[PDB]
RNA sequence: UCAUUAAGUUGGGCACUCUAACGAGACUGCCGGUGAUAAACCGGAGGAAGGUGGGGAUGACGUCAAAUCAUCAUGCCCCUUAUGACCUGGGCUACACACGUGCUACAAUGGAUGGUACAACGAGUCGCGAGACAGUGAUGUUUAGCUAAUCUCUUAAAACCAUUCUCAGUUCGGAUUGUAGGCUGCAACUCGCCUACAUGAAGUCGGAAUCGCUAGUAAUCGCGGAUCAGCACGCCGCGGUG
RNA sequence: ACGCGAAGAACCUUACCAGGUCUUGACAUACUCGUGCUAUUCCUAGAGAUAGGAAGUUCCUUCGGGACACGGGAUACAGGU
């Protein structure tokens, strides 16, 4: 629409000190089940607490590096000549898309509990390989085809 | 039909199982406020005017 | 059920045909009928609205109403079903 | 015997290990869960040694599972033609609540 | 106990008759914990920005009286009831009340719904017949 | 669709024609008193209806009435609404009450202007000069925003013709509409005539606030 | 194609000229890619055909377009209105194919 | 213990000015807990906005109930001599109890 | 608050709930970059609220001859032995089949384990209807209270910890069924239920596609009306989470 | 257009049909009359209708009777949802 109509803001964590704790609640939390959502998030820094026992931001922020790409895409046409001319949006939206990525693979895995397949992707996020880095290189390799800007 | 459907339920039938009530202008079927003895549809014909403390502009 | 329910005038034909003769049909009406164990072995009609159905009774006919004595709920039936 | 000795599962309670069985369930299988004093039990891959021997005739209160088969059979197959206002609808196949069969009840109704 | 300070703030069909004790920062809601009235739900730690983290800090024993609402309703009554109640014990927290708000008790809610509409923003569905 | 001004005024934005309260039988006495109001408007059949507000009271009823003039309607000297009032006592069986009050200047009433000119439409008046005539009479007599409306139906015709001189600042969308408005159907062999009279002398009309 | 809904909504239905409907929408199935749904909805009345209303709606898989048009004869409404569907697809060539205009 | 409900479907009409004919009972009397605005009791109507077909929209009418009390412990039966007069409106849901 | 313990309920305490009956409370009001000059914009402070604070309403010249011949009626038609009726049950809801159509599932956030805390919550001492109770529940057995800012409703759910089923057509998933009972009414199949129980089918996340969703907004959970002897996932509003 | 009129027609409720089913019409305003308190309650049969009988109707003001018009002779036409 026309304007920069305002967004909303949730508060950052005092427990493990990240706003993406409660934004991780903003993607795992479905049907407004915020207490179960915090049970999964606090249970996931508990998944850090068995595996490494370190700060949440090691696995959580290396995970953020895995799931925050550089580039995203856009449809831009001449009259049908859809040059996929790209953009590189800011870390609130990039972090938001990475939250879609961790809710994606840390949701849709046929394992035992939400903290068990989210133990597969928060613990494999502690293994910091595979699906996330490919889940951004799937757009990163396209940029050479996205070399055109407004040329023809 | 206006008298087998107005006058008939005015005539004593068996019970409430038989003679279901309605307003007394036109014997219109249910959706009838028996708490105010009048039909919705026929009480709406008043609610052209309205003699009620309800707000009139369709809240 | 507690506080049972039963016919009245063709209850007086249960008591007017149980004593006299177990034979005839009736211009019946019943959504309010039953069957007693004494009632078995006779013939009664079922009011669909045109055909007072002449059915004798067997002990299988437990105490239902004449709205469900025989399936006189007319629906044809053998055309396109199941 | 065998009734309780029929087709043992592991990992379960005996109550689900008897709703598992054709019949005895949440009223009665919990009733003889307590009457044999079982109470979860198993999750074991062992039922007991002798609460079997209780639950032979303690379980054998239902008359019978094979006469649940012959109780549906002995019930309805006499109950064919009372009307047959209900038996024809039940065995032609529609759920005979007196149920609105216009569109839905699609699986038992038959597409 | 002693006489109140009239802390009259609330939100969203809740009542926060906040009993106001000049104290240490002790929080006891209806003689209980609000993690015993509505467990828990980190809104226990969104009592702090109403009261404790407000200006870092306000230290009074607020024996809070509430009912109504819920994890956002009477926690909004924590916001206006206990932020405004903190203003009632000490009126020197409007640096925070107009640094961050914590007032108006805005009562944002669902519309005066049009009859016929389900949630006033959703229909059954339509394809095109 | 068109909003009815009195249809959003006379309930609570203007106070009630049933300007009384009850506890349980509110719609009972209200609706049956509206049937009684129908009996008033049909048993003024040799008179002129203006306005009536039948009331229930502490004495379980006070009938509020209005006339279009006292000198002709109320009786030979005042005994038609009084003898017919006792006839209402032998209708519903209650203490029954007369209120002889002329609705002042009924050439500024939507009832007598539009219904009178509709009775002259029964007398087959040229309806355009009837519009200019009557709305010129009352617009001549004030009526800060004033219009009307006539439907069609001439011996097998369409729905509605036009409406000349349907004028006057009647800000019906706005929330300042103080309008004596009416409407009418004239049933004939040739058809029916809708007559809808907007009269706007007063400017303001909420009647809903009191300390 | 996929599905119809033939509906004579005042007079009974007769599948000679309804088959002619089925064949000119057969030429819709010469100009089809997925004939997702259609619906015939026609209306003829008294007084020696002072009208001839017909209708068919066209929910294709991307576009939807109905046709409630008239002639004196209902046969002529099937004629000129289904020919109007042909010329509508003739209007729908560049409106369908030429997603480039340049 | 004279206690007066002016129960009203809405108090905010002339029945708010009915508080003065009972203020005739406030005078010639003392110890007046005066006008108490009672919690309003609501009521709901939902009806077809059209007549018979095409129900896109409905209508609602929330008949609420704005009530009133005055609480005087002493009757002072010259205020029962003031009980005989009660002017406006014709009929309101008034309760004058002990 | 004198509380001073069935207890918010008291001889009482009184604005505390603010109770709703009232006024004042945000009007570019003020300021800066401004705007051709203005209307305005951008923002700032104040301001509880900031740019018509927010939400309903307010359907216009006019269109759709569509709907209202079952409120309302004229043209004519059957209007008088008939399309006007009294009764009686069976249809009206029937089902080869498409879309209208929501909930329920497929699952571990579930499903059992418990004890929460909440807005609502309107009719009513006409009726709602206790901790008096046979209970599996329908309902009795009692109806206490109940002219409602009394009372039975009104103690709603998720968040709470407790155990497991942590993996599967699954303590499943609830299609029926056969019943075995109660409620309603004169009567529960057509043409209401509800409470068991036993068997417990699909179903292992949904073509083409569609639609809705930028704030308490989707999602979500409850309450009442709603009709009414009986009978409501979607059926009105309100809010609980988010 | 389809949680649509119809936010509850168990069913005579219903629109409409079957059957019993009458024709001053069930419901009717209508001219006229031997003339009146219409009672409810019944009993008989019948599916109930609907028929028969029992007390259930033989004038409330100067008296025709208004009043219950009683039940009829009948223009009149309500009663098609």
UniProtKB/Swiss-Prot annotation, chain C:
GO terms for biological process: ribosomal small subunit assembly; translation. GO terms for molecular function: rRNA binding; structural constituent of ribosome. It comes from Lactococcus lactis subsp. cremoris (strain MG1363). Belongs to the universal ribosomal protein uS19 family. This is Small ribosomal subunit protein uS19. SUPFAM superfamilies: Ribosomal protein S19. It holds the Pfam family Ribosomal_S19. Keywords: Ribonucleoprotein, Ribosomal protein, RNA-binding, rRNA-binding. NCBIfam families: rpsS_bact (TIGR01050). Protein S19 forms a complex with S13 that binds strongly to the 16S ribosomal RNA. The keyword Ribosomal protein applies. GO terms for cellular component: cytoplasm; small ribosomal subunit. The keyword Flavoprotein does not apply.
Curated annotation (Swiss-Prot), chain F:
NCBIfam families: rpsC_bact (TIGR01009). GO terms for biological process: translation. The keyword tRNA processing does not apply. Part of the 30S ribosomal subunit. Forms a tight complex with proteins S10 and S14. InterPro entries: KH_dom, KH_dom-like_a/b, KH_dom_type_2, KH_sf_prok-type, Ribosomal_S3_C_sf, Ribosomal_uS3_bac-typ, Ribosomal_uS3_C, Ribosomal_uS3_CS. One of its GO terms (molecular function) is rRNA binding. SMART domains: KH. This is Small ribosomal subunit protein uS3. Binds the lower part of the 30S subunit head. Binds mRNA in the 70S ribosome, positioning it for translation. GO terms for cellular component: cytosolic small ribosomal subunit. It comes from the Bacteria. It comes from Lactococcus lactis subsp. cremoris (strain MG1363). Belongs to the universal ribosomal protein uS3 family. Gene3D superfamilies: 3.30.300.20, Ribosomal protein S3, C-terminal domain (3.30.1140.32). Residues 36-104 form the KH type-2 domain. Disulfide bonds: none annotated. Pfam families: KH_2, Ribosomal_S3_C. Keywords: Ribonucleoprotein, Ribosomal protein, RNA-binding, rRNA-binding.
Curated annotation (Swiss-Prot), chain G:
GO terms for molecular function: ribosomal small subunit binding. One of its GO terms (biological process) is negative regulation of translational elongation. Disruption phenotype: No visible effect on growth until cells have been starved for 5 days; cells recover from starvation less well than wild-type and are dead after 14 days starvation. No 100S ribosomes are formed even in stationary phase. One of its GO terms (cellular component) is cytosolic small ribosomal subunit. The keyword Isomerase does not apply. Keywords: Cytoplasm, Translation regulation. Residues 1-102 are annotated as: Probably still associates with ribosome. It is found in: Cytoplasm. Belongs to the HPF/YfiA ribosome-associated protein family. Long HPF subfamily. Interacts with 100S ribosomes in stationary phase; alters the relative position of the 30S and 50S subunits. Required for dimerization of active 70S ribosomes into 100S ribosomes in stationary phase; 100S ribosomes are translationally inactive and sometimes present during exponential growth. Able to dimerize E.coli 70S ribosomes in vitro. The N-terminus (residues 1-126) is homologous to YaiA and HPF of E.coli and can associate with ribosomes, while the C-terminus (residues 126-185) seems to be a functional paralog of E.coli RMF. This is Ribosome hibernation promotion factor. It comes from Lactococcus lactis subsp. cremoris (strain MG1363). The lineage of its organism: Bacteria, Bacillati, Bacillota, Bacilli, Lactobacillales.
From Swiss-Prot, chain H:
One of its GO terms (molecular function) is structural constituent of ribosome. Gene3D superfamilies: Ribosomal protein S10 domain (3.30.70.600). InterPro entries: Ribosomal_uS10 (IPR001848), Ribosomal_uS10_CS (IPR018268), Ribosomal_uS10_dom (IPR027486), Ribosomal_uS10_dom_sf (IPR036838). Part of the 30S ribosomal subunit. This is Small ribosomal subunit protein uS10. GO terms for cellular component: ribonucleoprotein complex; ribosome. One of its GO terms (biological process) is translation. The gene is rpsJ. Involved in the binding of tRNA to the ribosomes.
């Amino acid at each position: 629409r026309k304007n920069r109509a305002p967004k909303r803001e949730v508060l950052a964590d005092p427990m493990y000190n990240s706003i993406v704790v409660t934004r991780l609640i903003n993607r795992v939390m479905l049907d407004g089940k915020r207490g179960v959502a915090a049970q999964i998030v606090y249970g996931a820094f508990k998944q850090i607490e068995e595996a490494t026992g370190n700060n949440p931001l090691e696995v959580f922020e290396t995970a953020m590096e895995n799931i925050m790409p550089v580039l995203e895409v856009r449809a831009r046409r001449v009259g049908g000549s859809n040059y996929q001319v790209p953009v590189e949006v800011r870390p609130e939206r990039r972090t938001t898309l990475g939250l879609r990525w961790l809710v994606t693979i840390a949701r849709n895995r046929g394992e035992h509990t939400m903290q068990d397949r989210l133990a597969k992707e928060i613990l494999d996020a502690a293994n910091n390989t595979g699906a996330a880095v490919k889940k951004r290189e799937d757009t990163h390799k396209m940029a050479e085809a996205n070399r055109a800007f407004a040329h023809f | 039909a206006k008298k087998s459907m107005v006058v008939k339920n005015q005539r004593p039938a068996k019970f409430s199982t038989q003679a279901y009530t309605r307003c007394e202008r036109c014997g219109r079927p249910h959706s009838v406020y028996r708490k105010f003895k009048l039909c919705r549809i026929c009480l709406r014909e008043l609610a052209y005017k309205g003699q009620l403390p309800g707000v009139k502009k369709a809240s | 059920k507690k506080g049972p329910f039963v016919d009245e005038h063709l209850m007086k034909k249960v008591e007017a045909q149980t004593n006299a003769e177990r034979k005839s049909v009736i211009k019946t009406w019943s959504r309010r009928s039953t069957i007693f164990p004494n009632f078995v072995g006779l013939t009664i009609a079922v009011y669909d609205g045109r055909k007072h159905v002449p059915v004798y009774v067997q002990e299988d006919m437990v105490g239902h109403k004449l709205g469900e004595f025989a399936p006189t709920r007319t629906y044809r039936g053998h055309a396109a079903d199941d | 015997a065998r009734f309780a000795g029929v087709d043992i599962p592991n990992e379960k309670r005996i109550v689900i290990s008897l709703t598992y069985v054709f019949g005895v369930g949440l009223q009665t299988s919990k009733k003889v869960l307590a009457a044999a004093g079982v109470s979860e039990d198993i999750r074991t891959k062992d039922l007991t040694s002798d609460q079997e021997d209780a639950i032979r005739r303690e379980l054998d209160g239902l008359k019978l599972e094979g006469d649940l088969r012959r109780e549906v059979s002995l019930n309805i197959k006499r109950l064919m033609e009372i009307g047959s206002y209900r038996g024809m609808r039940h065995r032609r196949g529609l759920p005979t609540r007196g149920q609105n069969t216009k569109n839905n009840a699609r699986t038992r109704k038959g597409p | 106990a002693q006489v109140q300070y009239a802390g009259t703030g609330r939100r969203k069909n809740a009542v926060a008759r906040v009993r106001l004790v000049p104290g240490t920062g002790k929080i006891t809601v209806n003689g209980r914990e609000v993690e015993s009235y509505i467990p828990h739900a980190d809104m226990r730690l969104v009592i702090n920005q109403p009261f404790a983290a407000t200006q870092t800090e306000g230290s009074y024993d607020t024996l809070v009286n509430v009912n109504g609402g819920g994890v956002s309703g009477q926690a909004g009554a924590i916001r206006h009831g206990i932020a405004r109640a903190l203003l009632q014990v000490d009126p020197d927290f409007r640096s925070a009340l107009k640094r961050a708000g914590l007032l108006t008790r805005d009562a944002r809610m669902v519309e005066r719904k049009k009859p016929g509409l389900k949630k006033a923003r959703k229909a059954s569905q339509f394809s095109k017949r | 669709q068109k909003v009815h001004p009195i249809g959003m005024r006379v309930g609570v934005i203007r106070d009630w024609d049933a300007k009384w309260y009850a506890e349980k039988e509110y719609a009972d006495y209200l609706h049956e008193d509206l049937a009684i109001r129908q009996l008033i408007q049909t048993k003024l059949a040799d008179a002129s209806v203006s306005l009536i507000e039948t009331e229930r009271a502490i004495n379980k009823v006070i009938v509020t009435l209005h006339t279009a003039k006292p000198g002709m309607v109320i009786g030979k000297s005042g005994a038609n609404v009084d003898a017919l009032r006792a006839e209402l006592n032998k209708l519903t069986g209650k203490q029954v009450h007369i209120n002889i009050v002329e609705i002042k200047k009924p050439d500024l009433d939507a009832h007598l202007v539009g219904e009178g000119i509709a009775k002259q439409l029964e007398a087959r008046i040229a309806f355009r000069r009837a519009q200019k005539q009557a709305i010129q009479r009352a617009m001549r007599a004030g009526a800060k925003g004033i219009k009307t409306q006539v439907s069609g139906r001439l011996n097998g015709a369409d729905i509605a013709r036009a409406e000349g001189y349907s004028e006057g600042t009647v800000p019906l969308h706005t929330l300042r509409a103080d309008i004596d408005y009416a409407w009418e159907e004239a049933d004939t062999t040739y058809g029916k005539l809708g007559v809808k009279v907007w009269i706007y002398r007063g400017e303001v009309l909420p009647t809903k606030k009191s300390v | 194609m996929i599905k119809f809904n033939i509906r004579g909504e005042n007079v009974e239905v007769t599948d000679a000229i309804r088959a002619y409907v089925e064949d000119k929408i057969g030429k819709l199935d010469k100009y089809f890619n997925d004939g997702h749904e259609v619906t015939a909805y026609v209306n003829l009345k008294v007084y020696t055909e002072k009208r001839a209303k017909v209708e068919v709606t066209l929910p294709a898989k991307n576009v939807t377009l109905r046709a409630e048009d008239t002639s004196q004869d209902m046969y002529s409404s099937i004629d000129f209105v289904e020919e109007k569907l042909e010329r509508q697809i003739r209007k729908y060539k560049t409106r369908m194919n030429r997603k480039p205009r340049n | 213990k004279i206690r007066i409900r002016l129960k009203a479907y809405e108090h905010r009409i002339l029945d708010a000015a009915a508080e003065k004919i009972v203020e005739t009972a406030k005078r010639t009397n003392a110890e007046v807990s005066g006008p108490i605005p009672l919690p309003t009791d609501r009521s709901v109507y939902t009806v077809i906005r059209a007549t018979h077909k095409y129900k896109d929209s409905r209508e609602q009418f929330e008949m609420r109930t704005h009530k009133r009390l005055i609480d005087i412990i002493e009757p002072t039966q010259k205020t029962v001599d003031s009980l005989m007069k009660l002017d406006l409106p014709s009929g309101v849901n008034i309760e004058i109890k002990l």
